[PDB]
Design a protein around this ligand. Structure first.
Ligand SMILES: Nc1ncnc2c1ncn2[C@@H]1O[C@H](COP(=O)(O)OP(=O)(O)OP(=O)(O)O)[C@@H](O)[C@H]1O
Lengths: 194, 195
């Protein structure tokens, strides 16, 4: 079956910016259809607005290796042993840029990686109870033996990277989603990129 | 190679206090080439942390999803009504399991049997501290009833739920992560819970 209602079954009455700095905190005021058939009353929700991002999983299909980038993310501090995380290449998307354009650029800049073919993985909402942020992931064909370049660049086997997901050593959403997808799809990907 | 001793959090300055909070972290950290950074500031969205339950019936190979509006999805989605995992915020002194069991009962009338941790992830750690801890919980999908803020309960085959991830019809991080895990692990999990 699936979801019942569409973007046309909600009325956004007004938006209000409660905080504006590098990012924003907005208040949405809205009403929406109910499953029974009625119309909700007026609801307000706080929403963290920080734009949207492109993510690239660098995968070498011949070596069966991924490239990860390590750097500090201070928001991890309170719930992690260390705030230095192993992550995918990623960048914010500015007006007029494509996901692929940003993903290729950041792969070159962050990890010194020239990307061959790309393929979409998935596009996901990071945490839609409280933020609008959407991240669109591509897998990018790389030669992992060329990975060069603060930030530290790591080359590891696909199996090792996935075991690190299982063990909680990689535990940021973008990387977890990308590496789980790779564990499910690497056979067909290796075939396609031969 | 760095630990928390390699960070100095100078201050956390309140930027906004409402239902959620926004703080300015002011900090210095050690550099890979040696030495410390200067003062760095980052805006961090603080909303607590969450417990997430993937309700899985191993006898029937079915999963239970809950549907409701998430207005933050509006600007980038076909619809702001999302198909999701049971979830709730963890309050002081609560365990992940306490919250998962409570929300499973309240939102979907489900009693939970055995549980296994799937994984615990940071939603978007460049800008928010939020951590979400996912459990898979054994349920009898023939007890999945809608109760009676506005939620609809869906019972679907695991294969359909995973096909919806592939198609983008399920596209929130918690549900994508849980259902990808299930697609990787269901054969062993069904054996473990039907032995
Ligand atoms: N939470 C935040 N609060 C304030 N500014 C931010 C935040 N996140 C990112 N920025 C700004 O966005 C720029 C690019 O963001 P990005 O996620 O690439 O950070 P980064 O990897 O720490 O970057 P940098 O190489 O500048 O250290 C950062 O240099 C910083 O100026």
């Amino acid at each position: 079956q699936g979801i019942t209602f569409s973007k046309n079954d909600v009325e956004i009455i007004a938006r209000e910016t409660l905080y504006r700095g590098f990012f924003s905190l907005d208040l949405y005021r809205f009403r929406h259809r109910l499953f029974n058939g009625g119309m909700s009353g007026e609801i307000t929700r706080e929403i963290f607005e920080r734009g949207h991002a492109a993510v690239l999983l660098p995968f070498d299909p011949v070596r069966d290796e991924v490239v990860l980038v390590e750097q500090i993310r201070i928001a991890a501090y309170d719930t992690s042993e260390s705030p230095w995380l192993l992550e995918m290449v990623a960048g914010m998307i500015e007006a007029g840029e494509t996901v692929e354009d940003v993903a290729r650029r950041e792969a070159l800049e962050e990890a010194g990686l020239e990307v061959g073919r790309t393929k979409p993985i998935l596009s996901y909402l990071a945490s839609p109870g409280g933020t609008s942020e959407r991240l669109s992931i591509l897998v990018g064909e790389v030669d992992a033996s060329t990975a060069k370049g603060d930030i530290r660049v790591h080359v590891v086997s696909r199996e090792q990277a996935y075991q690190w997901v299982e063990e909680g050593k990689i535990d940021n959403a973008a990387s977890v989603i990308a590496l789980q997808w790779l564990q499910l799809h690497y056979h067909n990907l290796r075939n396609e990129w031969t």
